[PDB]
Design a protein around this nucleic acid. Structure first.
Lengths: 56, 73, 87, 176, 123, 36
RNA sequence: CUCCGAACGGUAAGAGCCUAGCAUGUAGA
């Protein structure tokens, strides 16, 4: 129900995207495919359970 | 339809929108029409991997966003 | 305690588990392209392994930047300043 | 050493003595197989020997810019900077073909437009065949008229860029 | 084939000689065509005569950018050639315009930590 | 952030140490003297 | 509904051999 809450969740996800894509290389590339994140640790990813719309 | 980036570290960062099953000749034609140059002088490398003007674009496996080092002949 | 524990929602013993998440992973693996698709970026295409079997052993940092090294060290992500190694 | 001509050269007014060709193309001309031989020195006479033994008329071939011996020999004579009498001697030779071709090409690159028409015009009569190397490596046999026509009317008939000869109408209105 | 060579040497000499005179008269023909168009514009017909084609070298057959598809510039450096590589209707999604960009929460111009610009043509 | 700079400094120190080790026992310094 | 961006954060460091476009214009006997 809180639009500001959802917008800030998206902003926080896009911020933590930084240094999870920027920690590898200091470039902040264009795409950096999202699947590197949302694979669980059972397969060997992160387990980044996301709430914001991260379109693949 | 693919967007390629004919780039260089010398003040020439061009973005050409070219076809999927197109050749490299027409891609050079676009890159020359866009930036400043004629068609027969341009050379698109990627670390000494000289792209020739008879193989196709999708055949060399280029896709949306691939940046290519421009060099004049 | 000197650590803010998000336990105000409920108690894991008396109140039990507040949430349920396995159905999220079950949908995520499907949306990422199934097992073979969501995996197919990794270097197991090789590795003397024909199928998916349990083999789970700067350890995790290297393991992660290697296991996704082709899904990360591609040309369509970074700029096209391709760089060759010594060998 | 391929810096100066010998010790002093009358600089063509266009760009420079050696720089009538593009910097990239000349820089490619130097590092080459055909340059490695015959770069020991070629002032007036051995140039004639190296010219009559190369039956190609072309510029660059291959993806990597590869200069033909025609083009490299044009550049070598350009660095040598021969006198006008020797060039008229090469332009007057009817037995050896590609020698006359090189003489015409050099007189075009370095020479007065009046002199260009005066010495290249009577080369517009020979109806003989001339071999040339295309950019893809494949050769083609063309007419000498095609060459001198692209040379006098068209721009960059070869890899070299031409130094902007006037339209003939202005000279016909002002001179011969 | 000497008999054929001298026959074609005139075939080329005629065309090359024809290009010279055709170039001289073109300056008068261009001025004369303006004079013909002058009287044509003067007293030919009040909206009753065209004698034209509206010819353009390269027709830019554009489309409709979806919602925020980038303004791609063809580059105006070589258009007299009328090369067929230009006629391709650059109105397509290049890299990220494949999405709808309407189901998104509020808006997403560029998530690259550089959004200096602020505009969408709403007004 | 700063960890990258720290690792770069450590790698530069290691490269300098390796260069000094290869130069001290160099063919032009050590083996050249060993042949003299 | 047409607003389109570029550089740095980037290419390990290495011992043996080799080639070169550039620069002074003088004091004094």
């Amino acid at each position: 129900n809180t639009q500001e809450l959802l917008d800030l969740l998206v902003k926080c996800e896009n911020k933590i995207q930084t240094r999870i894509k920027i920690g590898l290389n200091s470039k902040m590339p264009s795409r950096f495919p999202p699947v590197v994140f949302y694979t669980p640790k059972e397969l060997g990813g992160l387990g980044m359970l996301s709430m914001g719309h991260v379109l693949i | 339809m693919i967007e390629v980036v004919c780039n260089d570290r010398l003040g020439k960062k061009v973005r050409v929108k070219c076809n999927t099953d197109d050749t490299i000749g027409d891609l050079k034609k676009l890159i020359a029409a866009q930036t400043g140059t004629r068609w027969n002088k341009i050379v698109l490398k990627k670390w000494y991997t000289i792209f020739k003007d008879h193989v196709s674009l999708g055949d060399y496996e280029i896709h949306d966003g691939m940046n290519l080092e421009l060099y004049y002949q | 305690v000197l650590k803010q524990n998000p336990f105000w929602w409920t108690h894991q013993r008396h109140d039990g588990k507040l949430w349920n998440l396995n159905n999220y992973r079950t949908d995520m693996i499907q949306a990422l392209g199934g097992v073979e698709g969501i995996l197919e970026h990794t270097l197991f295409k090789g590795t003397y392994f024909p199928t998916w079997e349990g083999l789970f052993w700067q350890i995790p940092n290297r393991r992660f930047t290697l296991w996704w090294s082709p899904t990360i060290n591609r040309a369509n992500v970074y700029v096209g300043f391709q760089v060759q190694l010594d060998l | 050493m391929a810096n100066r001509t010998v010790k002093d050269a009358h600089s063509i007014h266009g760009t420079n003595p050696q720089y009538l060709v593009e910097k990239i193309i000349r820089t490619r001309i130097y590092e080459s197989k055909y340059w490695k031989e015959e770069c020991f020195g070629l002032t007036a006479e051995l140039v004639v020997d190296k010219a009559m033994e190369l039956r190609f008329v072309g510029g660059v071939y291959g993806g990597n810019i590869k200069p033909t011996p025609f083009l490299c020999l044009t550049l070598k004579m350009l660095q040598i900077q021969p006198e006008k009498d020797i060039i008229v001697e090469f332009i007057k030779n009817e037995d050896f073909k590609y020698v006359r071709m090189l003489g015409a090409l050099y007189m075009r690159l370095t020479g007065t437009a009046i002199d260009c028409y005066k010495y290249l015009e009577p080369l517009y009569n020979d109806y003989r065949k001339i071999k040339s190397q295309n950019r893809n490596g494949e050769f083609e046999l063309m007419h000498v008229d095609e060459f001198i026509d692209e040379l006098l009317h068209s721009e960059r008939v070869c890899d070299i860029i031409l130094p902007r000869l006037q339209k003939r109408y202005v000279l016909e209105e002002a001179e011969q | 084939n000497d008999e054929e060579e001298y026959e074609a040497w005139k075939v080329r000499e005629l065309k090359r000689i024809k290009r010279d005179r055709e170039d001289r008269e073109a300056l008068e023909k261009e001025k004369a065509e303006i004079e013909r168009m002058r009287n044509l514009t003067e007293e030919e017909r009040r909206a009753e005569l065209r004698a034209n084609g509206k010819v353009i070298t390269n027709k830019a057959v554009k489309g409709k950018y979806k919602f925020l598809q980038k303004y791609y510039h063809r580059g105006a450096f070589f258009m007299d050639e009328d090369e067929e590589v230009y006629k391709r209707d650059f109105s397509a999604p290049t890299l990220e315009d494949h999405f709808n960009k309407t189901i998104l929460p509020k808006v997403m111009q560029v998530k690259n930590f550089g959004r200096s610009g602020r505009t969408k043509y709403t007004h | 952030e700063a960890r990258k700079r720290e690792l770069k400094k450590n790698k530069k120190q290691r490269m300098m140490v390796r260069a000094a080790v290869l130069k001290m026992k160099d063919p032009k310094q050590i083996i050249r003297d060993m042949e003299k």
